[PDB]
Amino acid sequence: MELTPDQQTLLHFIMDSYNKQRMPQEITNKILKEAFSAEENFLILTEMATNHVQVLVEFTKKLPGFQTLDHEDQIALLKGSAVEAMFLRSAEIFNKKLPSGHSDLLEARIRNSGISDEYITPMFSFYKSIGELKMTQEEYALLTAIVILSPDRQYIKDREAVEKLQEPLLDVLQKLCKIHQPENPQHFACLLGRLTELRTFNHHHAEMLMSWRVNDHKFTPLLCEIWDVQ
Amino acid sequence: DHQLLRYLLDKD
Ligand SMILES: O=C(NC1CCCCC1)[C@H](C1CCCCC1)n1c(-c2ccc(Cl)cc2)nc2ccccc21
């Protein structure tokens, strides 16, 4: 019923690794501070996204069991979840408590960041869907780990090995949901349901970036490998 | 070839 000693160890351990990320305040601070041109915004995105991938790799490598996976599967897992993890982290930052009105400003800044209207709709649709879940810090971290250790990812040769690693994280997440939100016996399933919506950002991610309202679309060497651009 | 990713996954 309650978390075992081992499950608390895993949770805290995963929480420690997740905290190594760039703090939410840092992101929202710069966005709210001053309106940037679509040019400056695109450059902010690439630098933010490059840092996020670097930290994501270090986070992934510390996930219990990931080191014993086939080297090519390791690559396949990171390459397949990098974009989803980035939008999930954006969702967390977007729905974080800010002073009155600020949330409207942040949303307005992003809406006019230079991103194509074509993609502004689904992105905010997902962001809002996430906010309605009243997720905790531990939930975001677990969900991100679950996203990374997805066995049903492409090019994965040994899916059973990945499954074994994802199971314990799901069990912990499930217990958390049944505790932090006893009133909603659908919270856990609803968290898992957002992951499918999260996957839709994969197919038209490159188009989303290339359609940025700027003249030049330059990315970092690391982003070129992880994303499908340039 | 994903050599940057491969590097980060090996010796940082
Ligand atoms: O810095 C950002 N993301 C970081 C990615 C890496 C993880 C940290 C967050 C940008 C930021 C928006 C404004 C224009 C500059 C770029 N950002 C996005 C976002 C918009 C479009 C794409 Cl294609 C991807 C993400 N959603 C956000 C919600 C809240 C705050 C910032 C958010």
Which chain A positions have a beta carbon within 8 Å of B8's beta carbon? Answer: 54, 57-58
| Interface contact flag, A75 B5, Cβ < 8 Å | yes
Give CA separation, A95 vs A50, A92, A179, in Å: 22, 5, 22
- Identify from B1, B3, B5 which residue to disrupt to test chain A contact, counting A C-beta atoms within 10 A and taking the largest count: B5
Q: Cα separations (Å) of A93 from A27, A33, A66, A135?
A: 8, 16, 27, 12
CA atoms within 13 A on the CB side of A102: 16
The experimental method is X-ray
Burial (CB count <10 Å: 0-12, 13-18, 19+), residue A229: middle
Q: Is B6 exposed, middle or buried (0-12, 13-18, 19+ CB in 10 A)?
A: middle
d(CA A154, CA A43) in angstroms, rounded, equals 30
Look up the CATH number of the domain holding residue A79.
Answer: 1.10.565.10
- For residue A1, give its domain range: 1-230
Report the distance separating Cα A143 and Cα A192, nearest Å: 8
Q: Report yes or no: A147 and A80 within 8 Å, Cβ to Cβ.
A: no
Q: Resolution in angstroms for this experimental structure?
A: 2.0
**Closest CA relative to residue A32, chosen from A103, A133, A97:** A103
What are the tokens at A202?
């994969």
Total domains in chain A come to: 1
Q: Does the CA dihedral A101-A130-A54-A117 come out positive or negative?
A: negative
SS3 label, residue A220: coil
A28 CA to middle of ligand 1, Å? Answer: 9
- Residue A91 CA: nearest ligand 1 atom is 28
* Shortest Cα distance, chain B CAs vs residue A226, angstroms: 8
What would you measure as the largest C-alpha separation in chain A, in angstroms?
56
Name the H helices within chain A: 5-18, 24-33, 38-61, 71-94, 102-111, 117-131, 137-148, 159-180, 187-203, 205-210, 221-226
